[PDB]
Structures are given as structure tokens and as C-alpha cells.
Paper text:
We demonstrate the power of the approach using two unrelated exemplar PPI targets: (i) p53/hDM2, an α-helix-mediated PPI37 that is a clinically relevant oncology target;38 and (ii) [name]/[name]-[name],39 a β-strand-mediated PPI which plays a key role at the synaptic junction and is representative of [name]-mediated interactions, which remain challenging for small-molecule inhibitor discovery. As a β-strand mediated PPI, the [name]/[name] interface relies on both side-chain contacts and an extensive hydrogen bond network that plays an active role in molecular recognition (H-bonds are shown as orange dashed lines); these features are not readily reproduced by typical (often hydrophobic) small molecule scaffolds. In our prior studies, computational modelling using BudeAlaScan55,56 and experimental analyses confirmed the Thr and Leu amino acids together with the terminal carboxylic acid as crucial for binding. Although [name] has a defined hydrophobic cavity in which the Leu side chain of [name] is accommodated (magenta area), it represents a significantly more challenging target for small-molecule mimicry than p53/hDM2.
Residue numbers in the entry:
A (entry chain C): 2 to 7
B (entry chain A): 651 to 682, 684 to 762
Write the structure that this text describes.
Amino acid sequence: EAQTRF
Amino acid sequence: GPLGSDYIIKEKTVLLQKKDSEGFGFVLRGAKQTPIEEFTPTPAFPALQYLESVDEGGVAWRAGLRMGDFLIEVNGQNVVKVGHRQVVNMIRQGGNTLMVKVVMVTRHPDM
């Protein structure tokens, strides 16, 4: 899994 | 229940409108999916992407989104079975506006 802050 | 798990399922659709110099205030986490097998949603695991964290008091928080919510739709496009990079691109398409549908699942423990 990847993750990205918005 | 004695024959199987019982769940409370709460759908939330929100319109997020942020300022230029802030974020929406959440972290998305999920899979990048395999072409070999289609993802089949289940109450316990309803979508590939979810909110790893939500900034308390941030834009997403004020609209009702919470850590653990699973992401179902982004701006009218279904993302239940969509990988992380494409979902990120979809979220960035709207600029300061983001409409999302998420679902919060809670398993009601029998004991």
C-alpha cells in the first residue's frame, strides 16, 4: 500500500 | 449474531471546499490491485482506499470524514476497485473542491 496526504 | 457477523454501515457524501494554502486534512491509504483477480467488496473490506488519518478540525474533519472511512466515489467516479495513484489523480483533478462518498463500517461485537 501507498499513502498520500491531501 | 449466532449465524454470523452483524455490521452497522453508514454512508457519508460530503463536498469539501478548501482554501489554496491548506490541505483537505486527510491521508489516503490503499493498494496501488492486481489485474489477475477482481476485488470483491465485503462489509469488512468495502473498498481499496481508506482514510488512514483525518486532521482533527481540518476541512475533511469539519465535513464529517473520519479515520477508517473507506472511499467509494470521488467526484462522481467509483473508486471501490481503483488503485492508489489513479485515485490520487482523481482527487487532485478538482483543485480546491472535492466531493467524496465514503462508508464507515462498524462490526457490532456479540460479546
